[PDB]
Each structure stands twice: as C-alpha cells, then as structure tokens.
C-alpha cells in the first residue's frame, strides 16, 4: 500500500480508502473495479528487493499511525509506531508465508522448526488433488472417502482452494495416557 | 500440487555449501516462505515462493 502523506487533512496515510474497498467488493459481489486499476490508480506498487532497501513499511496499517488515549492483558506485545517516514505498508504479514505454511493454524504459536515439518508432510498426505480423478489414468494416487474441511482455518486457505479440496478430517482428539500404546 | 509449482532450485559448489546460501536472509522477507524448506540435504538451497 502506497502510504504517501498526501493528506492535507491529517498526515500520512494509505493512498487508498474505505471507498476503494466497497468499490472493489462491488465486484466481489457481481464477480468492474480490478486489481489492475489498484496499480494504475497509483494505490499500490510492486517493490523488488533492491528498491525495497530504500523505504520504510508499517506492519499493520492502522495501528502504526494515529496518536493515543492500558493495552490488552490477553493480546501480545507489539512494537510501536516509530517515525512517520513510512513510505508503504503491508497487505498483511501472513503474506510472507507460502502455500505450505499458509495452512498451518497459528503458525505464530509454535517452535520455528515445527512449522517446517508441516511444510513437508502436507506434501505427503492424502486428499482430492483434482475432482477429475475419475478420468485420470495417473499411475498411483489416493483419495479420502469423506474429506472433511478443517474446523480451524486461515484466510490464506480461501485462496489456496482448501475448504473445497481438504486433506484430512476433524477427529475428536483426546490427549491422554491410556493403555500406553 | 501448488507448493511444487511455485518452487525454487539453486545449485551449489560441489559439496555442502555450509554458510551464506542455506541460511535465511533479511532480503528474503515477503518473497520466500521462511519455514517451508526441505529438511536435511538441500536444506535452504531449494526454496518456496
């Protein structure tokens, strides 16, 4: 998000507004306001690594901007809104992730390596790779009888076409010692 | 099926290029996934966008 301080009424701010949004969602509804325009409308840019070297980005848009007024005792502890030099802003941090990662619930709550393991087995599981396997003469392939979509999800999945082609089931887990098997 | 499509192979010297390569860089932020890489062997030499 280009965050030029192009705001006579205020300071710096995303060169896009709640208007652009409802104007885009307009098309989310009737499936007219493209992403293509969100570029031409100098609303957001494609920053390669090199160029990135010379810019300042605020993580969460909102938060790292306004003024002030005791945080939340249950939430986490996030760095502040330092400087206003902010050139651009993040679509959402979750975007540093890739396919794999993206399906991992609360990846921000595990040991660093654990999230890497899941990045390998998700590629070793069963599922429904394509709803055309009925006409697929591919040597070897597995499909689950009753594919259940996940209970815990990510917005990232919505795009990874998951809930429609899941890779498992929601079994009722019971974490405890029993027979000892 | 997806993960594999958006992938990254990157040759090495001739033996375990243990140092610079394999590591996770700052310039990696946002472009490559930070936790999804193949364990052992070519760990970090092959990346996922």
């Amino acid at each position: 998000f280009i965050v030029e301080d192009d705001e006579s009424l205020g300071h710096k701010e995303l060169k896009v507004r709640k208007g652009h949004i409802a104007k885009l969602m307009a098309t989310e509804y009737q499936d007219e306001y493209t992403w293509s325009s969100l570029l031409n409308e100098g609303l957001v840019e494609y920053i390669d690594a090199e160029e990135e070297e010379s810019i300042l980005i605020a993580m969460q848009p909102e938060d790292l901007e306004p003024a002030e007024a005791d945080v939340d005792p249950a939430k986490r502890i996030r760095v502040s809104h330092h400087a206003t030099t902010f050139t651009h802003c993040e679509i959402h941090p979750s975007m540093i992730l890739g396919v794999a990662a993206s399906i991992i619930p609360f990846p921000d709550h595990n040991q660093s390596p654990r999230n890497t393991y899941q990045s390998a087995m998700g590629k070793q599981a069963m599922g429904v790779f394509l709803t055309n396997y009925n006409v697929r003469m591919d040597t070897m392939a597995n499909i689950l009888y009753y594919p259940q979509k996940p209970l815990g999800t990510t917005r990232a999945m919505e795009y990874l076409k998951f809930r429609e082609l899941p890779a498992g089931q929601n079994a009722i887990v019971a974490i405890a010692c029993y027979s000892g098997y | 099926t997806l993960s594999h499509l958006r992938r990254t192979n990157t040759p090495i010297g001739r033996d375990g290029k243990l140092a610079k390569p394999r590591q996770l860089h700052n310039t990696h932020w946002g472009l490559v996934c930070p936790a999804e890489t193949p364990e052992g062997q070519a760990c970090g030499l092959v990346k996922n966008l």
């Binding site: 998000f1 701010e13 995303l14 896009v16 507004r17 709640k18 208007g19 949004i21 409802a22 104007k23 885009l24 969602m25 989310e28 493209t34 992403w35 293509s36 969100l38 957001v44 969460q60 848009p61 909102e62 679509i91 959402h92 975007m95 917005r155 795009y159 990874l160 | 997806l2 499509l5 958006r6 966008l49």
Partner: peptide
C-alpha cells in the same frame, strides 16, 4: 465517505482482488 481510513479486516478483500487477477500460478504463466 468513499474516502476514509482502511481498518485491518478490509485489506483481506484487496488480496482477494490480487488472486482474482494474478492467480496462484502467476509466475509460471506470464
């Protein structure tokens, strides 16, 4: 006010626009 700030929840829709146009395969294709 078709011109107001942009809360977090909003951004998600933007991303939607992305894949609507680009596509998970963006790279390989183009």
């Amino acid at each position: 006010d078709e011109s107001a700030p942009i809360t977090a929840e909003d951004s998600w829709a933007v991303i939607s626009a992305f894949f609507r146009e680009k596509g998970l395969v963006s790279q390989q294709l183009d």
